[PDB]
Design a protein around this ligand. Structure first.
Ligand code: FES
Ligand code: FES
Lengths: 66, 66
C-alpha cells in the first residue's frame, strides 16, 4: 500500500464529500474514485489516463436518479 | 503505480452505478480508496490506509432524507 491521493486538498486530513441525493440536478452523474480529476469530486475522465499509463482499472461511481 | 490493488483486476474498468431509489438510509458511504472489503461501499478501511500510508482519502457520502 502507498498514497492514492497525491495533490487533492492535502491540508484536509480526511477528504470526505457529502452528496444530497434529493438535489441531484442531472439524471446521471459521475463521481471520481481516482483522485486524479481536475474537477474532483466529479469524474473528468482522468481515470482513463491513469489506467492507460499504469495498467490500473479504476473508474467512477455513477449516480442515477428517477 | 496502482491505486486499486485487488478489486476485480480482471475487469477492464471498475465502474459502479447506483440507483438512487434503492438507497434507504439517511447516509451511505461509498469507497474512494479501493481498500474496502465491502467495495463499492466504504467500510472504514480508508482510515487505516491513511494512518499507514500518510494519505488523506475518504468516502463519498450519499445522503437521503424525507
Ligand atoms: S477522473 Fe477519477 S474516477 Fe474518473
Ligand atoms: S473504505 Fe475506502 S473510502 Fe472508506
Amino acid at each position: 500500500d502507498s498514497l492514492i491521493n497525491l495533490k487533492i486538498q492535502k491540508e484536509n486530513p480526511k477528504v470526505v464529500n457529502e452528496i444530497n441525493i434529493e438535489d441531484l440536478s442531472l439524471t446521471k452523474a459521475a463521481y471520481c474514485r481516482c483522485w486524479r480529476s481536475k474537477t474532483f469530486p466529479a469524474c473528468d475522465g482522468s481515470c482513463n489516463k491513469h489506467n492507460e499509463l499504469t495498467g490500473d482499472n479504476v473508474g467512477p461511481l455513477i449516480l442515477k436518479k428517477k
